[PDB]
Design a binder for this molecule. Structure first.
Ligand SMILES: Cc1cc2nc3c(=O)[nH]c(=O)nc-3n(C[C@H](O)[C@H](O)[C@H](O)COP(=O)(O)OP(=O)(O)OC[C@H]3O[C@@H](n4cnc5c(N)ncnc54)[C@H](O)[C@@H]3O)c2cc1C
Ligand SMILES: Cc1cc2nc3c(=O)[nH]c(=O)nc-3n(C[C@H](O)[C@H](O)[C@H](O)COP(=O)(O)OP(=O)(O)OC[C@H]3O[C@@H](n4cnc5c(N)ncnc54)[C@H](O)[C@@H]3O)c2cc1C
Ligand SMILES: OC[C@H]1O[C@@H](O)[C@H](O)[C@@H](F)[C@@H]1O
Ligand SMILES: OC[C@H]1O[C@@H](O)[C@H](O)[C@@H](F)[C@@H]1O
Ligand SMILES: OC[C@H]1O[C@@H](O)[C@H](O)[C@@H](F)[C@@H]1O
Lengths: 573, 573, 52, 104
């Protein structure tokens, strides 16, 4: 028996833990995955000296913990086997494939992570706010009050994640790109650093944020928190919440301890599901919410009929570019060069404080020293210069989020022939209208690796605005990127596989009224009809959004915890 | 000040820790890498429920922690850049490439791991003994005594690693392959399970061994070892051992703390280098042993002239096969089948104890139940059947090691069209003659990511026996694999990139006499001339070997620790 | 190239490759319909795909 | 050096070339359709013995060239299709279409 049980140790479960552990509740958290980040539990796996000296290797960490959600039956023909080798005469269900899944209506890129800290052990740490157009209402019919509430919640969420907008301010590459885009779109669009949940520790090391930054996940009481009560139980699959007959309260959480193999019940006053947008939905459907099995309008669900409908996933377009000659030359515009590199007389100088100069003295000092100390190198950019981290945020006239940066999630073999200092990534993210017909559903016959109902998608990007904007977004990336350089062969402009982006929303969506707003939870993230069941995560977000969703989910979680603190009393200690 | 300092927390450093911590020495261990395996420090990263349900993902873990040793300057032509993109007019040194390295005399596949537990956090756990022909002598001119000494040491090493030869005995696939090969080579060759450092915990989970199994790496004193003294210091680059002027003793270890950035000296009575075959050599050369820079016979080293010469790396050939129809049919040979799958009357039965039957009752029960419970599946092998783990060990008439198995280190995109139950890997490992001209050397101008002398290889597989055997080995794999099935398209018979195998030896090789045996350390792993400096690892092994080397290195380490225990006194506690 | 330019495949089964990186604006069918001269009679697993 | 080894295939009644009664080819003729598998038994055993023979023989000349590793080619690439209108002495006894003068 606990006051609060939290299912999942990602950043949203850790928001609940931070708030409720600190308010004096006796809290248990369960995660199906295991401790994986070193002694700081749930921390970012990129925070090792070795990864930040070898950042192109971190893609492997990401791939090693992303398990595909739904893989259709494979129908590739291999007809070069030896005649002696066994073969079936059909494309039978094999290798964990989902025979429920239509390959042409999938989110094939969707994947999940089962590790303590969830996906925050690997994420990019981009934490923009949503503007009004992307954001669910929290206050009706008072836009200024709605704005104020979101400001309060986002400010707190940014403190929990340690979001900032200046960690890359000393990068030549970053400023080169930022300034060029600002000049080219003079006035029409604004560019800034991507807001990043990160703290720079040195010129070559950034402590990226994670679940661990939100809550350190150490069992309590302990020496630094002697009056707090928290236990984390890894390798525990949560399987079901038990409803009372009234459908007004949850009475227990059924768990499966994966090490001992045993199944148990856990009692709490408050149950919080933060297993991610897929797995929250799976747990609820396994518990009698929504409808199990292939959708069937001749059998409508008794509870939460919009659960698993109106799902959204963003369109993602990507390319990389190779910096233009004009931009590279501009880095060294303040330099006077005499002689030829490698000779006795070679000299690269700048007149400091000359205001015929384009750059600050710090920039020019970096460049001069690189040029003098590495005369065999043909570029003016220092070797350890950090990557660009640039955005123009979503606006009505460009309704997509943008990142102009270097991401550790590379999508192809990493090329080695072109100097890495020249390369910039472009990722533009589109917003998807919620539609009832877009669904996440769970099989009544097929099970996943943990013996739970197999997830199945029925998804297409909506016709209309979603599709038109997606193609306008692609064009915008082609036009904007060209101001910085031409495309890099092997990273030409492309749409990524649906759901690779991992910004799935709306699977258990929020609204004011269950029926009118086709929703599952209220603005306190409380499941309609239930006193003591709350859902956290991106699954709550009911709108068409392009920006990265986690900060918005965390903000909703903070609001949810206010409701809990006001309506449930911590047990005596 | 410590009694013993150990550089590196791989399985060989942990052998030294196990032996010396337990004998009451005050021990410090430094590793340049960080804690990465969860709460069990230095443990195998495959020991998570999630990886063993998704084993094809573990390749990513391996790739994410293998950093190439020496990458030659890239000369690929990309001529499809936009005219606006910057480009150099030469193939200049970029992206961390090593301009010292001849691309045609490299071990391009060689890589290192910088993580607590070293490569044992990811390894395959194959731990065969070497036979006489592969093994260095420990006793001269008394082969039976030599045998006895190796038996004693290997027995102890096998206890430390928890090596066994029965963990796969209940696999249908394993036994199918094993038995077929035994029959086909009736008498001529013997097949057995690969010896594996592993303990099966359930039919679907194996606790693979690692450094952590050898020594748990927890600081001591602690509750379970209250009279022991050990500290592990991760994120500490060891840079130099300081020689006294006599070249008879090491007086300190120079370290660089990578978090604080500070450099310190550490004093011990005994210094143990277990940084791996590359990095032991780098540390020694950085300390004044051997010769820094491009080899030059007009400037012979004052100390350890054979350091970094006589290096060996194994040839590796690989393929995968798809099980033959005849073998698949044999799984179900004891079954009577009536009706057609999916109908009311379908029946798969066996007569238990009939000794017209080919298989034991347990096998037939597994098959019957799979066939009855999964009538839509066309194969008789159960879904969770473990992989084959088969070897015929090196012999004079087939002087290569073999593994007929499923390894988590896949080398290509994992194919999805052919059922995984059908697939078997084949890896044959050849022995390489030590030759003085095969060298690992370190640049006097180029530095690696940790500001240490850049490693450079000058390597070719020797002409003569090595090359002839390598090609005979390839042919042997082609002939043997054909008894099980035809090749799998996309995994056709091939030599792997030189050094991918990661069995590099001989970089600081062992022998009885420094000059006569062209060696660096004696049979106690003590560096000649030095009272208190010991080297552990594969770098010690001076012979041409085909089998996996770690168990042999650990056995040498056990012997080294006997010498230490007999010649150095632990400080009072 | 001469050889390839004059070898016309005898029987090509219906293609079932999934391309899911098209733009949302591009037309697509909801099935693997008979297209590009493929032979819907042909079992892809009992063919001489190289015959030409 | 290239290595190409060619195996013999037992004739079996079940291996067929047939023509569609609905689908037509580019010249508006009945579309050809194959129903073919290499026979179990001798054909398949020999094919795999042939592969092994190529691996053993080629090794006396040199190692494989990366990108041209030992492989079976797509069925029928070889273009040595036979027996579609086969010869024999007696139509029924020898399951055939033409006599030894190639007369139908
Ligand atoms: C490579 C990558 C880059 C990303 N970059 C960004 C970015 O820059 N900005 C951003 O906003 N978003 C980003 N995302 C998305 C972001 O990581 C997620 O939105 C966020 O982690 C969701 O938090 P969560 O706590 O709701 O769920 P998760 O982080 O998914 O955590 C859910 C947890 O629940 C557990 N669990 C699941 N099922 C069960 C069960 N049945 N029982 C018990 N436990 C269970 C899991 O093991 C997991 O740890 C990125 C994701 C990835 C992988
Ligand atoms: C994928 C894979 C599969 C393998 N499978 C097998 C197998 O089945 N059987 C087998 O016998 N072998 C196998 N090997 C090889 C085996 O893992 C190594 O032989 C073994 O780990 C070597 O042990 P070690 O302690 O000498 O060195 P390592 O395990 O390399 O450990 C050396 C340690 O030293 C540290 N270090 C390096 N430089 C410094 C420095 N300057 N200062 C401080 N610390 C430093 C490193 O961070 C590291 O942790 C495999 C390896 C890999 C990667
Ligand atoms: O695919 C990588 C992308 O993944 C998304 O989940 C992140 O939000 C982006 F920041 C990131 O660039
Ligand atoms: O490349 C993988 C191979 O790596 C080697 O280091 C191991 O010893 C083998 F067991 C393993 O199959
Ligand atoms: O695929 C090419 C082969 O084609 C066959 O038709 C020829 O008979 C062979 F000689 C030739 O090598």
């Amino acid at each position: 028996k606990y006051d609060v049980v939290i299912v999942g140790s990602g950043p949203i479960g850790c928001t609940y833990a931070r708030e409720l552990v600190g308010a004096g509740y006796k809290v248990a958290m369960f995660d199906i995955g295991e401790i994986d980040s070193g002694l700081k539990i749930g921390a970012h796996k990129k925070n090792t000296v070795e990864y930040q000296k070898n950042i192109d290797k971190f893609v492997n960490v990401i791939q090693g913990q992303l398990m595909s959600v739904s893989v259709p039956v494979n129908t590739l023909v291999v007809d070069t086997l030896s005649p002696t080798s066994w073969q079936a005469s059909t494309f039978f269900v094999r290798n964990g494939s989902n025979p429920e899944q239509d390959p042409l209506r999938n989110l094939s890129g969707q994947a999940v992570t089962r590790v303590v800290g969830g996906m925050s052990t690997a994420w990019t740490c981009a934490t923009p706010r949503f503007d009004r157009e992307q954001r669910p209402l929290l206050v009706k019919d008072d836009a200024d009050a709605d704005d104020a509430e979101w400001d309060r919640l986002y400010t707190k969420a940014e403190s929990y994640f340690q979001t900032g907008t200046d960690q890359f301010k000393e990068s030549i590459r970053h400023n080169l790109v930022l300034n060029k885009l600002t000049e080219e779109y003079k006035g029409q669009r604004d560019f800034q650093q991507i807001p990043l949940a990160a703290t720079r520790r040195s010129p070559t090391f950034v402590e990226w944020s994670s679940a661990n930054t939100v809550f350190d996940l150490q069992n309590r009481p302990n020496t630094d928190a002697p009056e707090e009560r928290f236990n984390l139980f890894p390798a525990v699959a949560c399987e079901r919440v038990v409803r009372n007959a009234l459908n007004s309260e949850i009475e227990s959480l059924h768990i499966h301890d994966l090490i001992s193999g045993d199944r148990f019940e856990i009692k709490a006053d408050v149950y919080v599901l933060t297993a991610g947008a897929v797995h929250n939905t799976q747990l609820l459907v396994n518990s009698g919410f929504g409808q199990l099995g292939r959708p069937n309008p001749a059998n409508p669900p008794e509870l939460l009929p919009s659960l698993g409908s109106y799902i959204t996933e963003q369109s993602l377009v990507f390319c990389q570019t190779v910096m233009s000659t004009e931009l590279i030359d501009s880095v060294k515009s303040d330099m006077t060069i005499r002689g030829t590199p490698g000779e006795l007389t070679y000299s690269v100088t700048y007149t400091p404080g000359a205001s015929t100069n384009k750059h600050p003295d710090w920039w020019n000092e970096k460049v001069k020293n690189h040029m003098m100390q590495h005369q065999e190198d043909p570029l003016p950019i220092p070797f350890e210069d950090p990557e660009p981290q640039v955005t123009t945020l979503f606006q009505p006239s460009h309704p997509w989020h943008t990142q102009i940066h270097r991401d550790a999630f590379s999508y192809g073999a990493v090329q080695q022939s072109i100097d890495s200092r020249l390369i910039v990534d472009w990722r533009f993210f589109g917003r998807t209208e919620p539609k009832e017909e877009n669904k996440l559903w769970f099989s009544d016959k097929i099970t996943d690796a943990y013996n739970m109902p197999q997830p199945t998608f029925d998804f297409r990007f909506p016709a209309g605005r979603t599709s038109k904007e997606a193609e306008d977004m692609m064009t915008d990336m082609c036009v904007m990127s060209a101001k910085i350089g031409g495309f890099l062969p092997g990273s030409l402009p492309q749409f990524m596989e649906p759901g690779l982006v991992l910004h799935l929303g709306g699977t258990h969506r929020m609204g004011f009224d269950e029926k009118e707003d086709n929703c599952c939870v209220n603005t306190d993230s409380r499941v309609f009809g239930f006193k003591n069941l709350f859902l956290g995560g991106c699954g709550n977000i009911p709108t068409a959004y392009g920006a990265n969703p986690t900060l918005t989910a965390m903000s909703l979680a903070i609001k949810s915890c206010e409701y809990i603190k006001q309506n449930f009393t911590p047990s005596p200690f």
